[PDB]
């Protein structure tokens, strides 16, 4: 292992099919993602703060803790976590949703890394986190308005970075399109990753707990969903759940809906209409 | 060459306790490099400590495969990149970030051949220093001698206990006032502890400022303008008369670590000599 090894980073706002995505990849005999590390987004966030401060960057540079030094330390830490927290495989992968808040930075550290940004209708992601009580620091789960505002901010940052690095380095994966057309999207995605096809990605539920298959954490919130085959049962559970003031203001609260192909006045969009 | 079994030196203590002096005196030695405060080392150590201290979080990490073994490997890797690459090469590498010694015992686990130097200075002196010079520490209220002494007490209690936990073969307590009054005595003892040959240049560190194999200083570190001077006795008791009488009254109660570390909490000042 080294900083030129091929790496796959999956992320997105939580409740956007990120666990499903990583499980479908884990079902491939030559790919290992594994569980959420939790620590990767925390160290990335710390590092970003040091960069969001000119005064601090000056102090660090005058201490010899330059970008070259920090980048070497970050590469070493991240590789140890990625490599050592799970089983070996030809193609290693990490899924921590908010790691992609540092997508451009990770792309600079790891020139052979590729990125999969999961996109789901923000109304679905928000209803999911509120109804299931999946906690996110900075999101008020008693407010659909707050959660949609924060969803919008988070996905805007991640989307802009995905586009910044470009289509050869980052692919947008729409959750609703994945579950509606799994072979179509997995074919495209594996070609983007430059990894040969394996049919097992279409029956990931059969690789749960198997050698070279899907390892699930009993304390992760998506585990009881990802044990099921790929299904379309979670497309529109949000419909009728959002207060009417938030429905009225939807396009203003969450302009990223329209930008990502979701009609902010459709309840719901017909996700599969060609 | 560098690796987690190499013989590292970690200097720390509460800020304003002679930690920059200590590292500069060692930097004056031809075979030792400490260099500037890294700033990031105490921050990543603090993050890690918060993970492993929450029982609920440790369970989540273990179930993700992010065990102590994995975390320790990652921490070793990060810390060595910073220590090695932020300064000049030397046979004996050193790191000085005052609060890194809040993770003294953990560091001694990660780096089994590391040794530790815990600087101890009269809390009244350290507190007056931070307040008078406005050296900011998250968690310390510089408007309050009482708060600052309370926080000094808590911080040095943790670091002292860890020094005593690892024991005399791994940690040496260095009293600032003793060092400035008797530097040949203390530097000889300290270099014997580190198993590094004596060098007289450690008593004339002022001559090694900005020199190759010598003392590299940051223009934005708060102790730089003091450490450019030779080792002196001018800062022993600047605090005397500067502390509110209500804080003097309650000194033993606010700061029981004073008496524990040999400083009379009713002496203004102790006879450090």
């Amino acid at each position: 292992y080294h900083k030129d090894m091929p790496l796959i980073f999956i992320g997105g706002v939580p409740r956007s099919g990120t666990t499903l995505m990583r499980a479908m990849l884990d079902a491939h005999p030559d790919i290992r993602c594994g569980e959420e590390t939790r620590v990767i987004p925390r160290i990335l966030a710390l590092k970003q703060m040091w960069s969001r401060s000119s005064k601090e960057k000056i102090r660090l540079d005058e201490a010899g803790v330059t970008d070259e030094v920090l980048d070497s330390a970050m590469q070493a830490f991240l590789l140890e976590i990625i490599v050592k927290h799970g089983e070996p495989a030809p193609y290693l992968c990490n899924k921590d949703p908010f790691a992609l808040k540092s997508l451009t930075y990770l792309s600079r550290l790891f020139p052979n890394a590729k990125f999969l940004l999961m996109v789901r209708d923000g109304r679905a992601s928000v209803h999911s986190m509120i109804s299931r009580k999946v906690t996110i620091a900075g999101f008020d789960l008693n407010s659909y308005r707050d959660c949609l505002t924060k969803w919008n901010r988070a996905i805007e940052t991640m989307y802009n970075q995905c586009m910044e690095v470009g289509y050869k380095k980052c692919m947008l994966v729409h959750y609703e399109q994945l579950v509606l057309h799994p072979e179509r999207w997995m074919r495209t995605l594996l070609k983007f990753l430059q990894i040969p096809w394996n049919h097992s990605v279409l029956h990931h539920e059969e690789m749960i707990g198997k050698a070279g298959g899907v390892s699930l954490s009993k304390v992760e919130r998506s585990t009881d969903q990802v044990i099921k085959p790929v299904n379309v049962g979670a497309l529109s559970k949000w419909v009728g759940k959002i207060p009417p003031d938030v429905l009225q203001d939807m396009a203003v609260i969450a302009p990223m809906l329209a930008k990502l192909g979701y009609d902010p006045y459709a309840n719901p969009p017909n996700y599969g209409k060609p | 060459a560098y690796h987690k079994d190499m013989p590292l030196i970690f200097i720390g203590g509460v800020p304003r306790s002679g930690t920059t002096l200590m590292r500069a005196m060692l930097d004056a030695h031809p075979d030792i490099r400490c260099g500037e405060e890294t700033r990031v080392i105490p921050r990543i150590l603090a993050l890690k400590q918060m993970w492993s201290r929450s029982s609920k979080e440790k369970i989540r990490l273990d179930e993700a495969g992010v065990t102590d073994e994995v975390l320790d490997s990652a921490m070793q890797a990060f810390l060595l990149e910073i220590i090695v690459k932020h300064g000049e090469p030397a046979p004996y590498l050193c790191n000085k970030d005052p609060f890194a010694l809040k993770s003294l015992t953990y560091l001694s686990r990660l780096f089994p051949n590391a040794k530790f130097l815990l600087m101890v200075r009269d809390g009244r002196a350290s507190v007056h220093s931070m307040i008078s010079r406005k050296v900011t520490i998250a968690g310390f209220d510089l408007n309050s001698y009482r708060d600052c002494l309370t926080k000094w007490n808590r911080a040095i209690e943790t670091m002292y206990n860890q020094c005593m936990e690892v024991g005399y073969k791994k940690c040496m307590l260095v009293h600032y006032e003793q060092l400035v009054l008797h530097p040949e005595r203390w530097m000889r003892t300290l270099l014997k502890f580190l198993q590094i040959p004596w060098n007289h240049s450690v008593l004339h560190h002022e001559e090694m400022i900005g020199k190759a194999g010598g003392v590299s200083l940051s223009k934005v570190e708060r102790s730089t303008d003091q450490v450019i001077k030779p080792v002196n006795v001018g800062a022993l008791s600047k605090w005397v008369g500067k502390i509110p009488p209500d804080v003097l009254q309650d000194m033993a109660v606010i700061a029981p670590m004073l008496a524990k570390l040999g400083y009379d909490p009713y002496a203004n000042p102790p006879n450090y000599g």
Binding site: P41, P97, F98, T135, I136, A137 | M50, S54, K56, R60
Partner: peptide, 8 residues
């Protein structure tokens, strides 16, 4: 003390 995720 930790949540499922952190958005900074």
């Amino acid at each position: 003390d930790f949540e499922d995720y952190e958005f900074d």
